[PDB]
Enzyme design. Sequence first.
Site, PDB file in Angstrom:
ATOM      1  N   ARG A   5       0.659  -1.262   0.062  1.00  0.00           N
ATOM      2  CA  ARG A   5       0.184   0.089  -0.017  1.00  0.00           C
ATOM      3  C   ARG A   5       0.695   1.115  -0.043  1.00  0.00           C
ATOM      4  O   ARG A   5       0.649   2.296  -0.683  1.00  0.00           O
ATOM      5  CB  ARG A   5      -0.866   0.005   1.104  1.00  0.00           C
ATOM      6  CG  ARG A   5      -2.020  -1.034   1.123  1.00  0.00           C
ATOM      7  CD  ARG A   5      -3.092  -1.275   2.219  1.00  0.00           C
ATOM      8  NE  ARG A   5      -3.947  -2.215   2.044  1.00  0.00           N
ATOM      9  CZ  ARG A   5      -4.516  -3.204   3.016  1.00  0.00           C
ATOM     10  NH1 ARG A   5      -4.054  -2.841   4.251  1.00  0.00           N
ATOM     11  NH2 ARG A   5      -5.532  -3.926   2.522  1.00  0.00           N
ATOM     12  N   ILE A   6       1.890   1.393   0.782  1.00  0.00           N
ATOM     13  CA  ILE A   6       2.531   2.597   1.177  1.00  0.00           C
ATOM     14  C   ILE A   6       3.572   2.701   0.060  1.00  0.00           C
ATOM     15  O   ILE A   6       4.021   3.941  -0.588  1.00  0.00           O
ATOM     16  CB  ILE A   6       3.191   2.571   2.167  1.00  0.00           C
ATOM     17  CG1 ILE A   6       2.073   2.701   3.573  1.00  0.00           C
ATOM     18  CG2 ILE A   6       4.305   3.734   2.721  1.00  0.00           C
ATOM     19  CD1 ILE A   6       2.465   2.407   4.905  1.00  0.00           C
TER      20      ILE A   6
ATOM     21  N   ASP B 174      10.179  -6.515  -4.631  1.00  0.00           N
ATOM     22  CA  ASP B 174       8.841  -7.191  -4.088  1.00  0.00           C
ATOM     23  C   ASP B 174       8.621  -8.364  -4.616  1.00  0.00           C
ATOM     24  O   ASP B 174       7.956  -8.840  -5.742  1.00  0.00           O
ATOM     25  CB  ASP B 174       7.678  -6.455  -4.114  1.00  0.00           C
ATOM     26  CG  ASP B 174       6.412  -7.045  -2.925  1.00  0.00           C
ATOM     27  OD1 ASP B 174       6.456  -8.166  -2.709  1.00  0.00           O
ATOM     28  OD2 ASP B 174       5.682  -6.124  -2.514  1.00  0.00           O
TER      29      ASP B 174
ATOM     30  N   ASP C  94      12.027   6.255  11.184  1.00  0.00           N
ATOM     31  CA  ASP C  94      10.852   6.594  12.149  1.00  0.00           C
ATOM     32  C   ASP C  94      10.487   5.241  13.023  1.00  0.00           C
ATOM     33  O   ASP C  94       9.559   5.513  13.819  1.00  0.00           O
ATOM     34  CB  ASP C  94       9.532   6.780  11.161  1.00  0.00           C
ATOM     35  CG  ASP C  94       8.354   7.193  11.968  1.00  0.00           C
ATOM     36  OD1 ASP C  94       7.498   6.184  11.819  1.00  0.00           O
ATOM     37  OD2 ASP C  94       8.238   8.159  12.659  1.00  0.00           O
TER      38      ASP C  94
ATOM     39  N   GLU D 221      12.451  -0.573  20.529  1.00  0.00           N
ATOM     40  CA  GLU D 221      11.745   0.514  20.861  1.00  0.00           C
ATOM     41  C   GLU D 221      10.714   0.532  21.961  1.00  0.00           C
ATOM     42  O   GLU D 221      10.236  -0.471  22.296  1.00  0.00           O
ATOM     43  CB  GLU D 221      10.614   0.485  19.696  1.00  0.00           C
ATOM     44  CG  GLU D 221      10.044   1.594  18.973  1.00  0.00           C
ATOM     45  CD  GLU D 221       9.055   1.535  17.859  1.00  0.00           C
ATOM     46  OE1 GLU D 221       7.757   1.522  17.952  1.00  0.00           O
ATOM     47  OE2 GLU D 221       9.541   1.163  16.758  1.00  0.00           O
TER      48      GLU D 221
ATOM     49  N   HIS E 249       8.168   7.202  15.552  1.00  0.00           N
ATOM     50  CA  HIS E 249       7.167   6.325  14.861  1.00  0.00           C
ATOM     51  C   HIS E 249       5.641   7.272  15.157  1.00  0.00           C
ATOM     52  O   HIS E 249       4.770   6.698  15.532  1.00  0.00           O
ATOM     53  CB  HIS E 249       6.905   5.083  16.051  1.00  0.00           C
ATOM     54  CG  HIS E 249       6.415   4.096  15.598  1.00  0.00           C
ATOM     55  ND1 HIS E 249       6.807   2.798  15.298  1.00  0.00           N
ATOM     56  CD2 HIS E 249       4.980   3.824  14.798  1.00  0.00           C
ATOM     57  CE1 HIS E 249       5.923   1.989  14.790  1.00  0.00           C
ATOM     58  NE2 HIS E 249       4.864   2.580  14.563  1.00  0.00           N
TER      59      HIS E 249
HETATM   60  N1  LIG Z   1       3.484   4.668  11.632  1.00  0.00           N
HETATM   61  C1  LIG Z   1       4.221   3.895  10.804  1.00  0.00           C
HETATM   62  O1  LIG Z   1       5.511   4.058  10.800  1.00  0.00           O
HETATM   63  C2  LIG Z   1       3.508   2.815   9.999  1.00  0.00           C
HETATM   64  C3  LIG Z   1       2.242   2.794   9.696  1.00  0.00           C
HETATM   65  C4  LIG Z   1       1.854   1.969   8.763  1.00  0.00           C
HETATM   66  C5  LIG Z   1       2.697   1.038   8.380  1.00  0.00           C
HETATM   67  N2  LIG Z   1       3.823   1.050   8.868  1.00  0.00           N
HETATM   68  C6  LIG Z   1       4.562  -0.119   8.143  1.00  0.00           C
HETATM   69  O2  LIG Z   1       5.010   0.186   6.574  1.00  0.00           O
HETATM   70  C7  LIG Z   1       5.272  -1.162   6.191  1.00  0.00           C
HETATM   71  C8  LIG Z   1       4.449  -1.126   4.905  1.00  0.00           C
HETATM   72  O3  LIG Z   1       3.151  -1.020   5.266  1.00  0.00           O
HETATM   73  P1  LIG Z   1       2.066  -1.504   3.968  1.00  0.00           P
HETATM   74  O4  LIG Z   1       0.554  -1.071   4.461  1.00  0.00           O
HETATM   75  O5  LIG Z   1       2.316  -1.018   2.674  1.00  0.00           O
HETATM   76  O6  LIG Z   1       2.027  -3.147   4.148  1.00  0.00           O
HETATM   77  P2  LIG Z   1       1.483  -4.083   2.787  1.00  0.00           P
HETATM   78  O7  LIG Z   1       0.696  -5.141   3.410  1.00  0.00           O
HETATM   79  O8  LIG Z   1       0.346  -3.317   2.132  1.00  0.00           O
HETATM   80  O9  LIG Z   1       2.479  -4.352   1.709  1.00  0.00           O
HETATM   81  C9  LIG Z   1       3.778  -4.905   2.263  1.00  0.00           C
HETATM   82  C10 LIG Z   1       4.661  -5.357   1.218  1.00  0.00           C
HETATM   83  O10 LIG Z   1       5.656  -5.984   1.503  1.00  0.00           O
HETATM   84  C11 LIG Z   1       5.819  -6.937   0.614  1.00  0.00           C
HETATM   85  N3  LIG Z   1       7.062  -7.908   1.127  1.00  0.00           N
HETATM   86  C12 LIG Z   1       6.792  -8.885   1.633  1.00  0.00           C
HETATM   87  N4  LIG Z   1       8.025  -9.792   1.891  1.00  0.00           N
HETATM   88  C13 LIG Z   1       8.910  -9.046   1.408  1.00  0.00           C
HETATM   89  C14 LIG Z   1      10.068  -9.330   1.330  1.00  0.00           C
HETATM   90  N5  LIG Z   1      10.851 -10.254   1.731  1.00  0.00           N
HETATM   91  N6  LIG Z   1      11.010  -8.362   0.808  1.00  0.00           N
HETATM   92  C15 LIG Z   1      10.360  -7.284   0.152  1.00  0.00           C
HETATM   93  N7  LIG Z   1       9.128  -7.025   0.145  1.00  0.00           N
HETATM   94  C16 LIG Z   1       8.412  -7.596   0.709  1.00  0.00           C
HETATM   95  C17 LIG Z   1       4.570  -7.671   0.270  1.00  0.00           C
HETATM   96  O11 LIG Z   1       4.711  -8.463  -1.090  1.00  0.00           O
HETATM   97  C18 LIG Z   1       3.748  -6.432   0.268  1.00  0.00           C
HETATM   98  O12 LIG Z   1       3.519  -5.831  -0.932  1.00  0.00           O
HETATM   99  C19 LIG Z   1       4.903  -2.212   6.949  1.00  0.00           C
HETATM  100  O13 LIG Z   1       5.776  -2.826   7.930  1.00  0.00           O
HETATM  101  C20 LIG Z   1       3.703  -1.677   8.296  1.00  0.00           C
HETATM  102  O14 LIG Z   1       3.672  -1.999   9.734  1.00  0.00           O
HETATM  103  C21 LIG Z   1       4.379   1.695   9.447  1.00  0.00           C
END
Ligand SMILES: NC(=O)c1ccc[n+]([C@@H]2O[C@H](COP(=O)([O-])OP(=O)(O)OC[C@H]3O[C@@H](n4cnc5c(N)ncnc54)[C@H](O)[C@@H]3O)[C@@H](O)[C@H]2O)c1
Lengths: 318, 318
Positions: free
Chosen positions: A150-151, A171, A257, A262, A281
């Site tokens: 997503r991000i 990915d 971040d 943590e 964070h």
């Molecule tokens: N406040 C914050 O800092 C905050 C908020 C939301 C999410 N996040 C973090 O950001 C990160 C991304 O979030 P998201 O919503 O995009 O998750 P997501 O589920 O939408 O996508 C995650 C991606 O990671 C990929 N992936 C899986 N294994 C992998 C690997 N070995 N190597 C490379 N890529 C791989 C998956 O195929 C997927 O496309 C997550 O770790 C989430 O916890 C942080």
Amino acid sequence: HKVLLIGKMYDEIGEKLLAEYTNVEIIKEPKQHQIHEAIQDVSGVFVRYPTKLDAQAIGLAKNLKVISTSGFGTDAIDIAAATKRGIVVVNNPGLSTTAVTEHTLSMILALAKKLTFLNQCVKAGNYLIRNQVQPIQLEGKTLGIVGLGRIGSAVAKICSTALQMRVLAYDPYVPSGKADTVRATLVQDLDYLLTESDFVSLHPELTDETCEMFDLEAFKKMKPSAFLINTSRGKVVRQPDLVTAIREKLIAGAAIDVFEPEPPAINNPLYEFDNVIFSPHLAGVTPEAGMAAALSAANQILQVLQGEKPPYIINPKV
Amino acid sequence: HKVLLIGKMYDEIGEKLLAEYTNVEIIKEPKQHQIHEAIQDVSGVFVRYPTKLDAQAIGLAKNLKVISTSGFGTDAIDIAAATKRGIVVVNNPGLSTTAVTEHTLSMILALAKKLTFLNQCVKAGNYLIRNQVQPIQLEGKTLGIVGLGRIGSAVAKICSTALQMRVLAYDPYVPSGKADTVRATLVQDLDYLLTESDFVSLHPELTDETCEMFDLEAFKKMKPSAFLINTSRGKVVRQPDLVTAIREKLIAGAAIDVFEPEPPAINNPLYEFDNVIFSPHLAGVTPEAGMAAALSAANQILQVLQGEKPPYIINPKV
Ligand SMILES: NC(=O)c1ccc[n+]([C@@H]2O[C@H](COP(=O)([O-])OP(=O)(O)OC[C@H]3O[C@@H](n4cnc5c(N)ncnc54)[C@H](O)[C@@H]3O)[C@@H](O)[C@H]2O)c1
Ligand SMILES: NC(=O)c1ccc[n+]([C@@H]2O[C@H](COP(=O)([O-])OP(=O)(O)OC[C@H]3O[C@@H](n4cnc5c(N)ncnc54)[C@H](O)[C@@H]3O)[C@@H](O)[C@H]2O)c1
């Protein structure tokens, strides 16, 4: 019908949408026994992360039809206990996706522009440092995104089109062709992302393969002039290897971040460097993101309580 | 023909393009008499900011046809003395607009995300402020752009589409429809841009109409929650009135790259506030920006030395 708020929601907007259609009881600072003495005659439950939801509480809930988590974490709810009693377990993830993408963009631009370092100098009367610092122009530089979820996609999309960056992506579990919808190029060898990138932004899920994925071995492959951005999870970087990557100048800087220990200690070695920029964070913490989490929790409760299937069921078997 | 480089160019590219077609003499660290003893048998002159160009040096130049500045500033060249001997004075503006656009984006994001304030706290062991700070989400907010020119248009274009902001513009001398090409809406009443904007970014030309345009009267109209970004010119803001806007909290914060008086002193009253972040007039200072200025200064010399009218003549009367 009755709805129980095991803990407060991220914003009051979701508490009013539920109280608009149901009777809402709020348990602030929930204790273990308090859940059982109110979950009995209740049709919907909101569980604020990270408080637990026992198989005991699900059993004492007789009319329970939907349990909703506060965010993405569902590891504190007994999912198995609800599929048996017919209860639908619903999720609320990705509701801070535009907030985190804006945040990583903020940090990529701050690293490129030396924002924090230049601010300190000007404030210290050292305006004259402008003859010793060269801001970086993002246009034409390559940005390697690890995790095209997503991000990562939204970050790739903005950097590829608006910022005119060449965007590479790593990915393995993403449909080849997804990167084109977002103007990135899917890459199969992570070493290629490291050697071609001027900026590396981490957005993967924390799996058993991405834990400490960014090693000292990865850092040695990156350009000395390259930067690292991490808004994902602390464990995705071996934090000690990042400290030596900055100290030995294998890396040009980093924006973080999320932290492996943590919260980070007061005596954290990374704090020493102007090279390294931090935020506590907060990447996904915006008021609009909190409302979306509250609204999505209240909407998925009313969907189950009226027949309609909610979008984020972890229990497809109901 | 002979061309004199009064000071080095911002990049070696313009010196070789000139050396390709002319005989080039370079005066590093130029003194006035050094200018006098070399400007004599010379057809084109490049003046690196901020060194002076006297009526004496212009008078000693007999075969001089074009003088080119290093950037936008021409206040150290006797333009009146050159219009008399028929010499064409050429400018080099607009060659760093992508650099300033990226820089203003950096500062809008930093203000919304409280980037500098969050970094210093984490480094100071105050990781716990995350319960007291709310980052702002840019999506849906209104960005008011003052001056829909080169930089103002580029900032609008990125913010309207990629950052999903509603972008307003105030520019009396711009064709309504220029804002439409850029997915902003052109506005005729500056009061509308001040009362509707969550972020106001200044990119106008410094005239006698925009000089101190942003008064205490202007700040009173802005939202208490709004931010001010200034990468244009220091004099477009009445600097003391900015201090009372920050002090009395009429405004939520401000980011400035340009100062009046410039350079800022050690005792600047704005340095007191975490609200306000600074950069030392580096918005347009990137390596790629230096090359475009170097080439454009070298090209406008060869344009005059070969017949063609250069684009940036401050001397239209020849
Ligand atoms: N406040 C914050 O800092 C905050 C908020 C939301 C999410 N996040 C973090 O950001 C990160 C991304 O979030 P998201 O919503 O995009 O998750 P997501 O589920 O939408 O996508 C995650 C991606 O990671 C990929 N992936 C899986 N294994 C992998 C690997 N070995 N190597 C490379 N890529 C791989 C998956 O195929 C997927 O496309 C997550 O770790 C989430 O916890 C942080
Ligand atoms: N911080 C830096 O390093 C840096 C670098 C380059 C330029 N600048 C400054 O940024 C500003 C914008 O640069 P540019 O290349 O876009 O110039 P530009 O001339 O292309 O645009 C400036 C705009 O100002 C507008 N304007 C004039 N009077 C106005 C008024 N009363 N109200 C509103 N708008 C008005 C003009 O219509 C014009 O469109 C200039 O002041 C320039 O000196 C700063």
